[PDB]
Design a protein around this ligand. Structure first.
Ligand SMILES: CC(C)CCC[C@@H](C)[C@H]1CC[C@H]2[C@@H]3CC=C4C[C@@H](O)CC[C@]4(C)[C@H]3CC[C@]12C
Ligand SMILES: CC(C)CCC[C@@H](C)[C@H]1CC[C@H]2[C@@H]3CC=C4C[C@@H](O)CC[C@]4(C)[C@H]3CC[C@]12C
Ligand SMILES: N[C@](CC1c2ccccc2Oc2ccccc21)(C(=O)O)[C@H]1C[C@@H]1C(=O)O
Ligand SMILES: N[C@](CC1c2ccccc2Oc2ccccc21)(C(=O)O)[C@H]1C[C@@H]1C(=O)O
Ligand SMILES: *[C@@H]1O[C@H](CO)[C@@H](O)[C@H](O)[C@H]1NC(C)=O
Ligand SMILES: *[C@@H]1O[C@H](CO)[C@@H](O)[C@H](O)[C@H]1NC(C)=O
Lengths: 765, 762
């Protein structure tokens, strides 16, 4: 095998993918001209720069022991045993202060697993696996590049910036895509971002699974943003599938897509507002001059350089010199077009970080001299790592390329700080090319002007607009996270932010729709349309009572109708006066006592009617006394019946679901008193009918007019009872008209029964 | 130094032949029990397998055995030799698998190094609990159980004896810490409470052990302690307990075992200690092979010369020893020899299974089997082994098989420290734990009856519903029994909740809703005299009314107060009815009418007495108008009274719970005082008006009696009120007394009013 050994006080290991992965016949293959040779030359250039430097390791000269991994984990594991064979102390071995890690994640994982046992620090330049951040398994591993979940964090931040909550995610098979998609799921659920579909493209499929994935993505039109954390060939396949289909999606991609033109080739219409993340890097201008001035004759340090030269230019060296072509001095890298790899600055940073750690340990442990001393002969990997590698703070070796984030340092897990570039595929004059629109070092710095507002108009990626509970509620029919508005009734309130609750007839929902409040009470008739109605009604009743009292007072001297009828006329006057109080108690505020007084008014009216009927039954003082006792007993029986049906007077709630308004009206007391009122009103009608039949008028105690007056008053009671009988049933509402009609009718009856009785008194006098 | 021998299938080996000697030589003296005996057991097993026509009959097993010097770095360096045989690049020998690792750290390092190169490893003495995860060691197997199976066994032992409150003692290293952690997991999975958790890590003087003993003893409710300690971490603790006179029922682990070096000088403290030890049996064939070993014929082992020199204190240069042998007296078989034999035989069985499955055409190593795939071997033929242990005591329970984690079957022996002998103290196997406990309760000193049982309870027995289960701040897990109030039902474990304002608790004290009923406030035994008095008064009033009606012929009908007499009779009837209804069951409206009825009746009698004042000053209608106005005023004041004192019920005055509610009305007692005060004021005004009368006969036959009786009636009425205040507690006695006084006053008034009629009758 071929190896690179350079003498020096301290030797640093190195592993590069110089040869591609072995085929099915050989263990190795063609030389990887970009990832292996360029990175090896970058390491050699950095080592030479450090060796000829004056302020970094002035007295210690660094050597290297570089090995070829052939892009295989097993080959790298076998080769890395040469690093640990020199630390046993039990082909001269060379001490290895540190090993520069491999490129592929599996290679780095295996190398770290082997090196953690022998306490050998490792710094990688291209490994971006989240598994390598586990310090319980890779406590001696570090890397100058950030892991791959920082890309997921950047995607989540970008989605949150544009207010995109309902997005579709597509990943690939393996471990990179799986880890990235799980990290993105974690970040999205941390930032409250819905995931519409979790599609998978596998590893290698025919152009039908990609079409199925595209159709599945199109099955949810609400999500117009697709999040891609997926490889650099399956991405092209998916783009081709979406080009074959008619779809318009905005892609949020990863470093797999980046700014590469391989994805966009042949399908430059589907991708027009895509967001792609790329690892930020800077070109080391000295490295281009160093590599362009390299020849297969003046560079014998690299054993792989001759084969790389003969493969790149397809010529033959001095081995045959005439096989296919002559590798003359005309062929050179300077004349040919040369592009620096995007991960050269990372290799340079890793080498310089190792050199800085060694310099710090030399200054600390071995002061007073700039030379390798006894105390620094053996290298303590654990102390060196944990004291001088995770605590580095030095600017980029080739920072003259202006940039604020040129500091090279590691976090607690040894990973580098994520500095990503946000790109956008845009148009200028028909030319299709990318354009940087921001960067993600620690926070978003997007230039919205350059993004063209993410294609024509800002795309919408939300599942329905936010829904205000004050007017309508929301539910989740099939989607757990997002919601669809459902109207909420004005008589219901949102107890929770998902469900509307009903106050009921007891209370009304509040304006804020966060609870119930005491609904306005029943309508007050004091300030209603008939505000002066009871006042006018009582005025006539008061005047009639005053006139009756005056007549009774004047009746003491020279009696006219007081001859055995004084008790009857006093009872009639008392009933008429009680009617005035009865008609005024209806408008009183709803109270059990108020409605009890209202019922007592009807009872008093019935007693007055009974007394009026008794007046005709007269045709002495003992017999009038017996009649007074009889009517008093009748009134007592009426009061007993009133108390019988007056038991546990309920408040009498009304305004049920038939009439559900803001204002609910209620009665004075329980609404079960209709039957009691009907029964009580029957007694008055019965006694009026009995008096009408008994009004024979066959005897005149003093004059025939009195019998005629009694008969006329009997007809008025029957007329008012029969006329108001239909109104008893049809008027069954709490409106003002129902009560005012009844009070007016009873007041008119009380006035008409008393007006005719006063006529004989004036005529007699 | 290596004893490797050429073979078709070479098996690696790692034994702690040399004890760790520090930095002086990286390993010191030769380990004569853990490095030599186990290595010779492996060699004997390999020889027997090579001489076995039923296991690998055509292929000969090789050996490549190295020494780890009881250190992890040396073990890694030695395992590098195992690795450097399959690299695609003396003479390396391919290793199909390694049987090595006696220390947990050594085994961990070896497994970490050999995992990357796909080399299966079977251990024989490593019992680390963190070697069971395949995410870090996916090519590691064990013939011994891990260190948490004994924790499960001890948890089951504690559950068997209903020991819920136990003390825990652990060590500072991984052994003891992992054991204690598994112990909390198994205890919380089995509802076992933990009193204390201390550390007795090494390099500590006697003071730390004495403090630990004192801390354990400051808890007389925890008589059982579990010891996750090493030999040196347990001997010191037992010595401290013995010298401090501490008695406990120790439940130890494999760190103690059946060793006699822990009970040396501390027999009293270690009395009745249950100990868990790994179950194993001696191998007679291995012992016989080991006896016939000499430094002259055993040329395979390079460490045998040093072992012979160190053990017998001899030297091969001075010819100090000539005829010596390891007979029964100097030889004691180790407890983990059978585990080494089982590991070697399991590896051989896996190799035989692969040979049969790959190329069954011939019983020889085929070309296809020459490249050995360690991953497939471990996944298929190593983990899936089911064979009887070689050289077994023929018991059916000795079967070798690996679990899904590549661990051994957990089989431990339960030991107790006997004192039931003549004068000798010794151990006894009193059970075993394979998958379930099989204890022999018969002997079980202390921890069984006939010797004094040792219970481990945090506190007293579980409390009944009649007392509050209170959690002690010091001891959280159990609860104490503290009686609560008799009327406070225990809603839950927290405390006794309130049944109600006046509701009696139920029997179960979970749902009571039992409000006592006192509808019959006044008993019928005492409600007889007032009823008879009221009936007599009503009869007298009826007779007086009838006589007055029949007295129309008497001259004194219009001049006299016939209407006044009727009003007085009506007032007497009203007060009698009020007393009768107040001596009955109270109601919401009954209390209001009782006060209104008493006031109206008092107004009626006062108005009747005030009629004499009107006659003293001077039309008959004037007195009627005055009495009607007084009655109307009294009615209005009573109306205002019950408007300000709205009717209600629920007078729960007495909180003694003997009688929470005594019926009555919810109206305040001050309202009753105001009505009585107003009645007394009216009576006093009436008496003053009567005494202010001038000198006039005015029917002196009746006026004198009325004047004499009015003062007495008013005095009785005014003295009835302080009776209630003197008792200072309203009850059925006050109501009956008030009713009796009212009825007596009414009867006296009626009698004095009717006295002229009775006098004129005769
Ligand atoms: C005799 C004439 C002058 C009428 C006298 C007024 C009487 C009937 C009035 C005055 C005060 C009234 C009481 C006032 C308050 C209440 C509480 C209510 O929840 C039930 C009715 C009840 C208990 C009333 C019953 C009727 C009442 C006692
Ligand atoms: C003053 C006395 C001598 C004669 C008049 C008695 C009057 C005031 C009494 C007799 C019957 C009584 C009613 C009987 C029952 C009830 C039902 C109760 O839920 C409220 C009070 C109420 C409605 C009472 C109010 C007062 C009442 C109407
Ligand atoms: N950093 C990478 C990232 C890599 C990767 C990147 C894009 C697509 C597929 C893909 O395969 C995986 C799988 C797991 C982890 C990381 C990756 C590495 O190999 O570690 C690779 C850039 C380094 C290099 O080879 O130069
Ligand atoms: N089986 C043991 C168990 C061992 C152990 C046993 C009792 C007390 C202390 C103690 O130290 C630890 C620490 C961690 C793990 C296991 C142990 C091993 O070395 O793994 C040890 C008997 C094996 C041998 O060396 O022969
Ligand atoms: C996202 O919404 C916020 C309000 O929640 C708004 O201030 C912000 O400008 C929005 N971002 C856009 C429209 O890019
Ligand atoms: C433990 O309690 C059970 C009942 O739960 C009982 O049957 C058993 O005998 C007890 N064990 C003892 C006292 O050793």
């Amino acid at each position: 095998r071929r190896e690179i050994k350079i003498e020096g006080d301290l030797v640093l290991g190195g592993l590069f993918p110089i040869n591609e992965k072995g085929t099915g016949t050989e263990e190795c293959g063609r030389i990887n001209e970009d990832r292996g040779i360029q990175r090896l030359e970058a390491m050699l250039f950095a080592i030479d720069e450090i060796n000829k430097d004056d302020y970094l390791l002035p007295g210690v000269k660094l050597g290297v022991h570089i090995l070829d991994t052939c892009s295989r984990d097993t080959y790298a594991l076998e080769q890395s045993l040469e690093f640990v064979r020199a630390s046993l102390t039990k082909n001269i071995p060379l001490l290895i202060a540190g090993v520069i890690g491999g490129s592929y994640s599996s290679v780095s994982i295996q190398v770290a697993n082997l090196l953690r046992l022998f306490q050998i620090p490792q710094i990688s330049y291209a490994s971006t696996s989240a598994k390598l951040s586990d310090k319980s398994r890779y406590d001696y591993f570090a890397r100058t590049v950030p892991p791959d979940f920082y890309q997921a964090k950047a995607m989540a931040e970008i989605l949150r910036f544009f207010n995109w909550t309902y997005v579709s995610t597509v990943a690939s098979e393996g471990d990179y895509g799986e880890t990235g998609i799980e990290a993105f799921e974690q970040e999205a659920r941390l930032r409250n971002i819905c995931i519409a579909t979790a599609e998978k493209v596998g590893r290698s499929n025919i152009r039908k699974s990609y079409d199925s994935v595209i159709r599945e993505l199109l099955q949810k039109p609400n999500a117009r943003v697709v999040v891609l954390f997926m490889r650099s060939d399956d991405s092209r396949e998916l783009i081709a599938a979406a080009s074959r289909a008619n779809a318009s999606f905005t892609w949020v991609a990863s470093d797999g897509w980046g700014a590469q033109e391989s994805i966009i080739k042949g399908s430059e219409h589907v991708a027009y507002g895509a967001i792609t993340l790329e690892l930020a890097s800077q070109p080391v201008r000295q490295f281009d001059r160093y590599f362009q001035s390299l020849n297969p004759y003046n560079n014998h340090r690299n054993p792989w350089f001759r084969d790389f030269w003969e493969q790149k230019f397809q010529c033959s060296l001095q081995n045959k010199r005439n096989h296919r072509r002559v590798c003359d001095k005309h062929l050179a890298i300077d004349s040919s077009n040369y592009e620096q790899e995007s991960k050269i600055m990372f290799v340079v940073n890793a080498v310089y970080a190792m050199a800085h750690a060694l310099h710090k340990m030399q200054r600390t442990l071995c002061p007073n001299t700039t030379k390798l001393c006894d105390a620094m002969k053996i290298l303590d990997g654990k102390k060196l790592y944990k004291d001088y590698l995770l605590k580095i703070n030095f600017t980029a070796p080739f920072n003259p390329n202006k940039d604020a984030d040129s500091i090279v340092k590691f976090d607690t897990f040894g990973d580098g700080m994520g500095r990503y570039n946000v790109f956008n595929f845009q148009n200028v004059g028909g030319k299709y090319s990318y354009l940087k629109v921001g960067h993600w070092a620690e926070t978003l710095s997007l230039d919205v002007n350059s993004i063209h507002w993410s294609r024509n108009s800002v795309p919408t990626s939300q599942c329905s607009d936010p829904c205000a509970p004050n007017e309508m509620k929301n539910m989740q029919p099939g989607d757990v996270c997002c919601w669809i508005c459902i109207p909420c009734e004005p008589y219901e309130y949102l107890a929770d932010e998902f469900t509307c609750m009903d106050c009921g007839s007891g209370q009304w929902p509040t304006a804020d729709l966060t609870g119930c409040y005491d609904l306005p009470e029943d309508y007050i008739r004091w300030e209603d349309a008939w505000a002066i109605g009871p006042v006018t009604i009582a005025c006539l009743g008061f005047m009639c009572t005053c006139m009756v009292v005056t007549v009774f007072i004047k009746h003491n001297n020279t009696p006219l109708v007081k001859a055995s009828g004084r008790e009857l006329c006093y009872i009639l006057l008392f009933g008429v006066g009680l009617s005035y109080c009865m008609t005024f108690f209806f408008i009183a505020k709803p109270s059990p006592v108020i409605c009890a007084l209202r019922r007592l008014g009807l009872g008093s009216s019935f007693a007055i009617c009974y007394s009026a009927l008794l007046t005709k039954t007269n045709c002495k003082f003992i017999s009038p006394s017996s009649q007074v006792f009889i009517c008093l007993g009748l009134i007592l029986v009426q009061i007993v019946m009133v108390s019988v049906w007056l038991i546990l007077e309920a408040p009498g709630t009304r305004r049920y679901t038939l009439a559900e308004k803001r204002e609910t009206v209620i009665l004075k007391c329980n609404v079960k008193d209709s039957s009691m009122l009907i029964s009580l009103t029957y007694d008055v009608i019965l006694v009026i009918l009995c008096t009408v039949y008994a009004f024979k008028t066959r005897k005149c105690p003093e004059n025939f007019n009195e019998a005629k007056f009694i008969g006329f008053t009997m007809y008025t009671t029957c007329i008012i009872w029969l006329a108001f009988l239909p109104i008893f049933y049809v008027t069954s509402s709490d409106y003002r008209v129902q009560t005012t009609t009844m009070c007016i009718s009873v007041s008119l009856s009380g006035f008409v029964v008393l007006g005719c009785l006063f006529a004989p008194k004036v005529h007699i006098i | 130094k290596v004893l490797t021998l050429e073979g078709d299938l070479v098996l690696g080996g790692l034994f702690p032949v040399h004890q760790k000697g520090g930095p002086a030589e990286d390993c010191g003296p030769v380990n004569e029990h853990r490095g030599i005996q186990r290595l010779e057991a492996m060699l004997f097993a390999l020889d027997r397998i090579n001489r076995d026509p039923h296991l690998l009959p055509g292929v000969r097993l090789g050996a490549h055995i190295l020494d780890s010097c009881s250190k992890d770095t040396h073990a890694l360096e030695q395992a590098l030799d195992f690795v450097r045989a399959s690299l695609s690049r003396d003479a390396p020998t391919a290793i199909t698998g390694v049987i090595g690792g006696s220390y947990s750290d050594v085994s961990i390092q070896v497994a970490n190094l050999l995992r990357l190169f796909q080399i299966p490893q079977i251990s024989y003495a490593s019992t680390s609990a963190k070697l069971s995860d395949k995410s870090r060691y996916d090519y590691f197997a064990r013939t011994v159980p891990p260190d948490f199976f004994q924790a499960k066994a001890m948890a089951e032992i504690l559950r068997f004896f209903n020991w819920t409150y136990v003390s825990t003692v652990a060590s500072e290293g991984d052994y003891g810490e992992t054991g204690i952690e598994a112990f909390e997991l198994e205890a919380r999975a089995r509802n076992i409470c933990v009193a204390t958790s201390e550390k007795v890590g090494r390099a500590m003087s006697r003071a730390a052990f004495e403090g630990v003993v004192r801390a354990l003893l400051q808890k007389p409710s925890a008589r059982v302690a579990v010891l996750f300690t090493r030999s040196e971490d347990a001997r010191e603790l037992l010595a401290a307990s013995q010298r401090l006179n501490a008695s406990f029922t120790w439940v130890a682990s494999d760190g103690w075992g059946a060793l006699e070096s822990v009970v040396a000088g501390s027999e009293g403290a270690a009395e009745g200690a249950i100990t868990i030890e790994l179950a194993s049996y001696p191998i007679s064939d291995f012992a016989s092979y080991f006896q016939s070993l000499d430094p002259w014929n055993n040329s395979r082992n390079p460490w045998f010369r040093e072992f012979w020199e160190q053990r017998f204190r001899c030297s091969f240069r001075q010819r100090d020893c000539a005829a010596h042998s390891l007979r029964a007296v100097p030889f004691e078989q180790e407890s983990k020899i059978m585990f080494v034999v089982n590991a070697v035989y399991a590896m051989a069985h896996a190799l035989h299974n692969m040979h049969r499955a790959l190329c069954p055409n011939t019983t020889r190593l085929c070309d296809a089997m020459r490249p050995v795939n360690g991953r497939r071997l471990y996944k298929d033929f190593v983990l899936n082994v089911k064979f009887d242990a070689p050289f077994r005591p023929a018991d059916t329970h000795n079967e070798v098989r690996f679990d899904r984690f590549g661990d051994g079957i957990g089989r431990y022996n339960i030991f107790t420290y006997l004192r039931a002998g003549s004068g000798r103290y010794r151990y006894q196997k009193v059970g075993y734990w394979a998958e379930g406990l099989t204890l022999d309760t018969s002997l079980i000193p202390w921890a069984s009856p006939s010797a004094g049982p040792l219970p481990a309870s945090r506190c007293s027995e579980p409390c009944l519903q009649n007392e509050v289960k209170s959690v002690q701040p010091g001891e959280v897990c159990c609860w104490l029994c503290i009686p609560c109030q008799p009327y406070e039902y225990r809603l839950d474990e927290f405390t006794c909740a309130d049944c109600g304002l006046g509701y009696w608790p139920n029997a179960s004290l979970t749902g009571c809703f039992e409000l006592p009923q006192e509808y019959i406030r006044w008993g019928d035994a005492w409600a007889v005299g007032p009823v008879t008095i009221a009936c007599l008064g009503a009869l007298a009033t009826l007779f007086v009314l009838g006589v007055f009606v029949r007295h129309n012929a008497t001259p004194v009908v219009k001049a006299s107060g016939r209407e006044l007499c009727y009003i007085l009779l009506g007032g007497v009837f009203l007060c009698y009815c009020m007393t009768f209804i107040f001596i009955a069951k109270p109601s919401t409206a009954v209390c209001t009418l009782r006060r209104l009825g008493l006031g109206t009746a008092f107004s009626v009698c006062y108005s009747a007495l005030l009629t004499k004042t009107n006659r003293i000053a001077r039309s008959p209608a004037s007195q009627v108008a005055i009495c009607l106005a007084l009655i109307s005023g009294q009615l209005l004041i009573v109306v205002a009274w019950l408007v300000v004192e709205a009717p209600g019920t629920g007078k729960e005055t007495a909180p003694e719970r003997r009688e929470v509610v005594t019926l009555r009305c919810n109206h305040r007692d001050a309202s009753m005082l105001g009505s009585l005060a107003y009645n007394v004021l009216l009576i006093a005004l009436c008496t003053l008006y009567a005494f202010k009368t001038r000198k006039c006969p005015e029917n002196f036959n009746e006026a004198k009696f009325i004047g004499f009786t009015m003062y007495t009636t008013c005095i009785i009425w005014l003295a009835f009120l302080p009776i209630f205040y003197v008792t200072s507690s309203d009850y059925r006695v006050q109501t009956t007394t008030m009713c009796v006084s009212v009825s007596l006053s009414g009867s006296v008034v009626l009698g004095c009013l009717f006295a002229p009629k009775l006098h004129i009758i005769l």
